[PDB]
Design a binder for this molecule. Structure first.
Ligand SMILES: Cn1c(C(=O)O)c(NC(=O)c2ccc(NC(=O)NC3CC3)cc2)c2cccnc21
Length: 164
């Protein structure tokens, strides 16, 4: 059901798309959220995915944190995908704007290997402060399963594809 994606490697594909609209169209088995350790979905991809679930993702996340405590930077948890997907894999990449170690980005992408196919954003990009070209390079060199990347900004998408 994924269509209009450029092929980067044997297993990594990319599209200039709104990940919420892409999830509603495809209804994948797994959509990846670019989460923080507290699962507080305020801005960026996290806020957009939560808003499309009418806040059901945040209510479910708050119960998960109340039971288990916060995630590790580089870690993940599988929760419901609500109206967007069967499941949502909440992955925490390092937030470079908070002094988190960039080496944890490879650990964050290793979580994708537990799932055969994923619709995902670039981790640690945007408001997390890491270089998006570096995030795409770590993705290609780490993920072995089929990943379909959705990049919202047209100019960033063109730069990622021309510099790859
Ligand atoms: C790299 N990046 C990305 C990205 O998705 O590539 C961000 N992504 C976003 O802000 C983002 C915002 C909105 C949506 N869609 C909807 O809300 N769609 C429903 C109305 C119909 C998806 C995503 C980002 C926000 C800060 C900084 N960098 C960002």
């Amino acid at each position: 059901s994924f269509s209009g994606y450029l092929k980067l490697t044997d297993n990594v594909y990319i599209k200039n798309a709104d990940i919420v609209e892409e999830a509603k169209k495809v209804k994948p088995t797994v959509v990846v959220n670019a989460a923080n350790v507290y699962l507080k979905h305020g801005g960026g991809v996290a806020g957009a995915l939560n808003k499309a679930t009418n806040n059901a993702m945040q209510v479910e996340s708050d119960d998960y944190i109340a039971t288990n405590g916060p995630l590790k930077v580089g870690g993940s948890c599988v929760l419901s995908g609500h109206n967007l997907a069967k499941h949502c894999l909440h992955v925490v990449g390092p937030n470079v704007n908070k002094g988190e170690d960039i080496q944890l980005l490879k650990s964050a992408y290793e979580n994708f290997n537990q799932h055969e196919v994923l619709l995902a954003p670039l981790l640690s990009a945007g408001i997390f402060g890491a270089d998006p070209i570096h995030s795409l390079r770590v993705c290609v060199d780490t993920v072995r399963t089929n990943v379909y990347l959705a990049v919202f900004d047209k100019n960033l998408y063109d730069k990622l594809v021309s510099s790859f």
